[PDB]
């Protein structure tokens, strides 16, 4: 689960396939402005340390 | 061996995007700061500019300064760079778009040289802390102690254990292009670059051309003022609009790799 | 730790860019509309509600994945050892791992 | 502000002697516990985006002399909302915020 | 401060120097202040002087 432990989950460090719930959840940018709004969880290994 | 990534520098400029704060508020600025990483222990930050401080245009000396102002670079000397939080910060190194340094903790990051006629600063928010490792939990690293395999990043350049994608710039604005014709608003390019191009009315729709004129509009504020540019290209920015026409190569390494040395 | 290491939004100027789910891991991208994007002129694309936006994001490792990284196992029970040393009876010595 | 008589906000009038001294602003510094962001000036009165800090230190360079001035002022910087940041973000939502202008008029 | 970081400006570099020390400053007095103030009461401080002699 994002946040929790383990929110990337990656076989190896070499695999190009993980599992990565973090709750990513774009949202607009602000008044007409270039930027790109990602929400998400600080991970579960952030935390977990 | 100054000379060993011109993967990045020959092949990347300085980028601009739109800082957050910058002094006032969102200015855009070429030092737009992405990516802190307050991830490792040793009081270090590495952190992304858009601005490729490192190199010149050209050739020489990593510790001169190009960003971009208007369109164009200004490959000139760093003299007093300040990235800062809390307190001011210590440099660490430079190379490409990226910088290290020398941190406290900080609820924010604060970023800025001085071209010297202008502060010319950027900011952001980021959540920073340095705890060292170790079950003491200071907050600084101290002269003495023992040692133990800390994280940290690099003081180096010659470095390839990650790379980031780093394809073409999309377009820019720039309505210094579009002056008047005297009745008609005028277009003109920098150097033959591409400059996309038509206005509201129904006047030449793409736009892949020397200095052209509008024959059906005259405002200004009506007009497609576009630079598709892309000799060099760029990170890419989450500050960035794409290069619509494709992915185009540049593949390009990091410096400031995080390292297991002991701190 | 992850890194949302954004790829670079796409801004139409004059209508809609529908976007696709790219298999990269956890691939978020979510088109939007209704922007003026400010960008070093001004804004430069003339519409004003038909200004598209498409963010994309995906999570990849950091490079601190490569080397500070936690590492999950399911553990069994193997087989112990020991360097065991006998400086036995006369012959005074052997430092033997079994 | 403007200067004795009647050009340039972005230049710097201060009182050496019983005399003013109606220069350029070069190296203005608002601070705290970090230095602050000027945001604008106009009379006795200057507006700059400033973290918390438990005072506030307030200065400029003549050029021959630092100069400054230093205050305590508790200051904190809550944002509206039910997050309670240390410093506002680039993006998020929108909200009924209390904040001075940047102008004049 | 947490830490305790000095430097001079030589003029071709920077050439400073930092160290670890934790620092406060309670002023004297059942008030724990961050700061000294303006105004109040006076009262016996320790404190370091402004001279040489
Ligand atoms: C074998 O069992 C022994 C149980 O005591 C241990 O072996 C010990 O190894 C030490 C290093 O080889 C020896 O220390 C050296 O002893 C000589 C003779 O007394 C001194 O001149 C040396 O200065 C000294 N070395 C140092 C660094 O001080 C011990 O003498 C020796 N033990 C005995 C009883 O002789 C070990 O537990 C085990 N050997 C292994 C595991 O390699």
Redesign the pocket.
């Known amino acids: 689960k994002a946040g929790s432990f383990g929110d990337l989950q990656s076989r190896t460090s070499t695999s190009n396939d993980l599992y990565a719930n973090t709750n990513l959840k774009l949202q607009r940018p602000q008044a007409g402005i270039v930027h790109t709004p990602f929400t998400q969880a600080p991970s579960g290994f952030e935390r977990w340390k | 061996d100054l000379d060993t990534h011109f993967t990045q520098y020959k092949l990347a400029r300085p980028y601009i995007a739109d800082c957050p704060n910058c002094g006032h508020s969102r200015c855009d600025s070429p030092i737009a700061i992405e990516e802190v990483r307050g991830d490792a222990h040793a009081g270090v930050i590495r952190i992304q500019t858009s601005a490729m401080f490192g190199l010149k245009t050209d050739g020489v000396d990593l510790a001169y300064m190009s960003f971009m102002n208007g369109k164009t670079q200004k490959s000139i000397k760093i003299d007093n760079l300040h990235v800062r939080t809390s307190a001011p910060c210590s440099l660490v190194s430079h190379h490409g778009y990226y910088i290290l340094a020398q941190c406290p903790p900080g609820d924010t990051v604060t970023v800025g040289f001085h071209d010297g006629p202008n502060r010319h600063t950027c900011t952001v928010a980021h959540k920073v802390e340095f705890r060292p490792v170790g079950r003491e939990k200071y907050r600084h690293p101290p002269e003495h102690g023992v040692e133990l395999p800390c994280n940290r990043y690099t003081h180096k350049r010659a470095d390839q254990g990650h790379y980031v994608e780093m394809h073409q710039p999309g377009l820019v604005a720039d309505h210094s292009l579009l002056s008047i014709h005297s009745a008609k608003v005028k277009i003109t390019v920098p150097s033959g670059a591409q400059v996309k191009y038509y206005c509201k009315c129904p006047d030449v729709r793409e736009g892949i051309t020397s200095s052209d004129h509008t024959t059906t509009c005259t405002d200004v504020k009506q007009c497609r003022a576009y630079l598709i540019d892309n000799k060099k290209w760029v990170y890419n920015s989450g500050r960035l609009p794409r290069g619509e026409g494709d992915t185009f190569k540049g593949k390009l390494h990091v410096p400031f790799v995080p390292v297991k040395a002991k701190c | 730790k992850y890194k949302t290491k954004v790829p670079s939004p796409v801004v139409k100027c004059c209508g809609a860019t529908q976007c696709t789910s790219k298999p990269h891991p956890d691939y978020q991208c979510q088109v939007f509309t209704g922007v003026y994007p400010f960008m070093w002129g001004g804004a430069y694309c003339f519409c004003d509600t038909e200004n598209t936006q498409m963010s994309e994001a995906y999570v990849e490792r950091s490079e601190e994945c490569s080397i500070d990284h936690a590492k999950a196992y399911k553990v069994h029970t193997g087989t112990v050892q020991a360097?065991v040393?006998i400086?036995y009876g006369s012959v005074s010595?052997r430092?033997a791992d079994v």
Do not use: E, I, Q
């Open positions: 360097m040393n400086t010595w430092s």
